[PDB]
C-alpha cells in the first residue's frame, strides 16, 4: 500500500540527473543536491535527465509517481486539490486529477491504478539524440505544495522507475519536490537551514 523509494541502479546503471539552474529570484525550476529536492513553479517545465551505463531493451519505459514523504501520510494518494482538479487546464491526455504530467510527448500514458488508486505517468525509453549522452523528460507539477485540500503543505517525493515492457522493476531513483511561487528563494532558505 506504499510504493518503494529504495534507490536501485539495476543492471543498466539507471540514475537521474538535474541541470544547474541557480537560485535567482526569476528561476522557475531548480534542484538542490544537498537536499535531494527539486523546487519548481506551478505548471512549469522541469527537465529530468535519465542516465544509464548500458542500453536497456526496446520496450523499456520510465514511470513517475508522487507519494507523501512523511510516513503518517504515505498511504494517502497524492492528487490535485479540489480547485485544480476542476480548473479545466487539460492538455487532452492527462486526467485532471493527476499532479504529474509529461510535457511534449504524445506517447505518454497516464495510469489510475485499479488496486491502489495511485496516479502515474509513463513514457517509452528513447535513446539520446545524436550528440547527447542522456535523455531528458520534461515534467510539470500541477498543484502547489500549499494547496488546501490537496498536498496541504505536506512534502512529497517523486519516484522514477525504469520498467520492462510488462512493468517489472529495472531501476529506481527519487527526489523530494516543493511546488512553490519562488523556487530560488526557497532553495536558498532550505539550504541555509540545513547548513545551520
Ligand atoms: O545510450 C543508450 O543507448 C540509451 C538508451 C536508452 O533507452 C533506449 C531504449 C530503446 C532501445 C532500443 C530501441 C528503442 C528504445 C536510454 N534511456 C531512455 C530513458 C531511460 C533510459 C538511455 I538515458 C540511453 O543512454
Ligand atoms: Zn491545487
Swiss-Prot record:
Outcome (variant: residue 160 to S): In sporadic cancers; somatic mutation
Outcome following mutation: residue 53 to E: In sporadic cancers; somatic mutation
Reported effect, residue 99 to I: In sporadic cancers; somatic mutation
Reported impact of residue 15 to C: In sporadic cancers; somatic mutation
Listed result of changing residue 158 to P: In sporadic cancers; somatic mutation
Result after altering residue 24 to D: In a sporadic cancer; somatic mutation
Effect recorded for residue 151 to R: In sporadic cancers; somatic mutation
Mutagenesis or variant effect for residue 40 to W: In sporadic cancers; somatic mutation
Mutagenesis / variant outcome for changing residue 137 to N: In sporadic cancers; somatic mutation
Effect of residue 148 to I: In sporadic cancers; somatic mutation
Positions where Phosphoserine occurs in the chain: 88, 174
Impact upon substituting residue 165 to P: In sporadic cancers; somatic mutation
Mutagenesis / variant outcome for changing residue 53 to Y: In sporadic cancers; somatic mutation
Signal peptide: none
Impact when changing residue 79 to G: In LFS; germline mutation and in a sporadic cancer; somatic mutation
Effect of residue 18 to I: In a sporadic cancer; somatic mutation
Free-text domain note: The N-terminal and C-terminal disordered regions undergo liquid-liquid phase separation (LLPS) following homotetramerization and activation. Post-translational modifications, such as phosphorylation or lactylation affect the ability to undergo LLPS. The nuclear export signal acts as a transcriptional repression domain. The TADI and TADII motifs (residues 17 to 25 and 48 to 56) correspond both to 9aaTAD motifs which are transactivation domains present in a large number of yeast and animal transcription factors.
Protein name: Cellular tumor antigen p53
Protein's organism: Homo sapiens (Human)
Residues of the full protein shown: 96 to 291 of 393
